[PDB]
Amino acid sequence: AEAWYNLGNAYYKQGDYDEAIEYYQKALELDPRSAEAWYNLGNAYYKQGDYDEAIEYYQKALELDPRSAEAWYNLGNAYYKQGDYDEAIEYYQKALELDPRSAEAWYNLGNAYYKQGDYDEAIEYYQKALELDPRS
């Protein structure tokens, strides 16, 4: 499974998402417990704009590695990109429980409240992000 996975990765890194998907599927045939292959299959679908499918695969990754702050954050992002800001909030909160020093997750939580039109909550979360990383 690991060799098919790394071939998929090489195709992903050169922007060839169709090929990445084919080789992650082959990895998952050989090892259905690869949280990494489910996650990167999600990412490949995310890059194609296929957020519905990205969410399915991130959920499978999180069944195997529920302590994946990465999968929780990208699951949030897949809802954010669809305009599903209240769903994004739930998954960003889960990412931040696992990694409370993620400036990214605090910032995107603030963005989700901003998009909901809750500016006072956006301010609170942006202030927390900027406390962690004041350079953006």
Contacting positions for Ca ion (CB under 5 A): 52, 67, 82, 86
Residue whose CB is less far from Ca ion, 7 or 121: 121
Residue whose CB is less far from Ca ion, 72 or 106: 72
In angstroms, give the least distance from the CB of 130 to Ca ion: 25
Q: Which amino acid is at 2?
A: E
In angstroms, give the least distance from the CB of 110 to Ca ion: 18
Residue whose CB is less far from Ca ion, 2 or 90: 90
In angstroms, give the least distance from the CB of 94 to Ca ion: 12
By C-alpha distance, which of 54, 59, 119, 45 is closest to 91?
Answer: 59
In angstroms, give the least distance from the CB of 75 to Ca ion: 14
